[PDB]
């Protein structure tokens, strides 16, 4: 016989171990593989698809009203419209997105993001907006003079009703953590603010309040690691008809 000795870790069940185990059905022939459309082989394919932000996560926004921001004609210049907190761990506008749900299965993240905004006013509606990204450090900028000093894009509503604000990966560390401290230097991403560059100017038969829809995806330099269970789902009891699977 072969002289052996057992190591520490013998007989344990790690839930992430990668071994071969006993076939319960020998000489079983699985069904032949058929081509099915839309195979996913890496979850970063899913994360690069744009999905709507709930920027209007306020009360008196009921259901689908949370998925759009209503901008109007203003009588003062340089006015703030909305801002977006960029914490993907924390329950903000970025949580229920394709980039936000798959990332909460992980703890560390890296890479650039993109914010796409589609203007959903009338053809007659004109206007210009500035979409600023501010790297972290201080407070969120509240005036336009303060906010345009960071990464921005000026967007006129015309024949193309969409822009992209690339949110660049500007970090000291290779990765950022999904830690509970949103004000941490390893977690805080910065801020996105939108201002009037000119004004939303409509005629008398366009609806005077127009809408934006914000989208967020990840770019192809995006990366996730350290896998954990999602805080988005959970139970304190067995589900209905789960006892009937034992009957």
């Amino acid at each position: 016989g072969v002289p052996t000795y057992l190591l520490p870790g013998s007989g344990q069940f790690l839930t992430t171990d990668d071994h071969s185990s006993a076939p319960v059905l020998p000489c079983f022939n699985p069904t032949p593989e058929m081509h099915i459309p839309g195979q996913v082989r890496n979850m970063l394919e899913v994360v690069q698809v744009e999905s709507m932000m709930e920027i209007n996560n306020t009360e008196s926004a009921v259901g689908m009203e949370r998925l759009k921001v209503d901008i109007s004609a203003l009588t003062d210049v340089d006015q703030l419209l909305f801002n977006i907190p960029l914490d993907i761990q924390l329950d903000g506008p970025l949580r229920n997105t394709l980039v936000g749900n798959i990332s909460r299965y992980y703890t560390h993240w890296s890479g650039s993001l993109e914010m796409t905004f589609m203007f959903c006013g009338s053809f007659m509606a004109t206007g210009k907006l500035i979409l600023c990204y501010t790297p972290p450090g201080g407070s969120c900028p509240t005036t336009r003079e303060t906010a345009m000093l960071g990464t921005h894009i000026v967007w006129d509503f015309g024949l193309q009703s969409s822009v992209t604000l690339i949110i660049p990966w500007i970090s000291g560390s290779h990765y950022r953590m999904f830690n509970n401290d949103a004000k941490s230097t390893n977690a805080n991403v910065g801020y996105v603010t939108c201002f009037m560059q000119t004004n939303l100017i409509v005629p008398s038969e366009s609806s005077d309040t127009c809408s934006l829809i914000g989208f967020i995806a990840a770019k192809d330099d995006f990366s996730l690691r350290l896998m954990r269970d999602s805080p988005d789902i959970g139970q304190i009891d067995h589900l209905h008809a789960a006892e009937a699977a034992y009957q």
Binding site: R41, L90, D232
Partner: protein, 290 residues
């Protein structure tokens, strides 16, 4: 176009741009396509050689985690005056992935899945005075869906002519089996937009081709003079996984295992009319640095 991606992609340096006829930051959401604006085209970038690997978000790694699928405690004792609705030293379980919600939401990120499932069974025992824990032998017999399951601990269905049984003890390492890909189709339907019978009275959403089988587990021992409480936890790990057509994750809490019904929580987050918890205004910043 399909390519092999082992690390995240590199950044190239860019310069001042000022060209008529070229507007890469403008896009068309209406086509259904995601924006292809690169970070080189929006800001001025530097050269970054990105060495961040992407292997942990592989669908094989994302899903091959052993997850709890079944948890059943039964009293192991002499069952003569016990009611007939109880588990008289054995239980039956129709194998599903719907009962525990971490694996359920994770598998329901896809429309179709083809995987082999390795099955770890963890048995634990407690005294129902204290005199010691017995080293009992358990039998887990894999019965296919709809076939004859045993009605007793000592029934003659446990002899397992062709049904695969595993016999294992409590003092051993946990029993581990690999169940193959057993669907009559080329993938499991995680969602089934249909009715599984030719009459208009069948169940909606339940395809019995998706069902693996029954897992009949008994204690091979006879009863001791004292009782014990035996908890059998079953762990499933998918492997050799192909996945098709990804889906929105479930936001509202699950109500049942039979269907995708929803109620939502009473307040935000994850309420019916409010998935994300509320802030004061759209120009209010929740964790603003002071």
């Amino acid at each position: 176009i399909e390519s092999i991606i082992k690390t995240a992609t590199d950044t190239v340096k860019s310069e001042i741009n000022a060209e008529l006829g070229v507007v890469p930051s403008l896009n068309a959401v209406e086509t259904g396509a995601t924006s292809n604006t690169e970070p080189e085209e929006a800001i001025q970038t530097r050269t970054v050689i990105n060495q961040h690997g992407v292997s942990e978000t592989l669908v094989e790694n994302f899903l091959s985690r052993a997850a709890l699928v079944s948890k059943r405690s039964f009293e192991y004792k002499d069952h003569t005056s016990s009611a007939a609705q109880t588990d008289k030293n054995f239980f039956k379980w129709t194998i599903n992935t719907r009962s525990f919600v971490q694996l359920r939401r994770k598998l329901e990120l896809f429309t179709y899945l083809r995987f082999d499932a390795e099955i770890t069974i963890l048995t634990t025992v407690a005294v129902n005075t204290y005199m010691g824990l017995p080293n009992l032998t358990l039998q887990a017999m894999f019965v296919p869906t709809g076939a004859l399951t045993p009605e007793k601990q000592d029934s003659f269905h446990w002899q397992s002519g062709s049904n695969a049984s595993v016999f294992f003890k409590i003092s051993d390492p946990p029993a581990r089996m690999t169940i193959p890909f057993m669907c009559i189709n080329s993938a499991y339907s995680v969602f089934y937009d249909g009715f599984a019978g030719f009459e208009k009275s069948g169940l909606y959403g339940i395809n019995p081709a998706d069902t693996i089988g029954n897992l009949c587990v008994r204690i091979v021992n006879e009863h001791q003079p004292v009782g014990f409480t035996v908890t059998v936890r079953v762990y499933m790990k998918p492997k050799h996984i192909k996945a098709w057509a990804p889906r929105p994750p479930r936001t509202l809490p699950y109500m049942s295992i039979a269907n995708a019904n929803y109620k939502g929580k009473k307040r935000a987050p994850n309420a019916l009319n409010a998935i994300i918890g509320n802030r004061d205004s759209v120009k209010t910043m929740p964790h603003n640095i002071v």
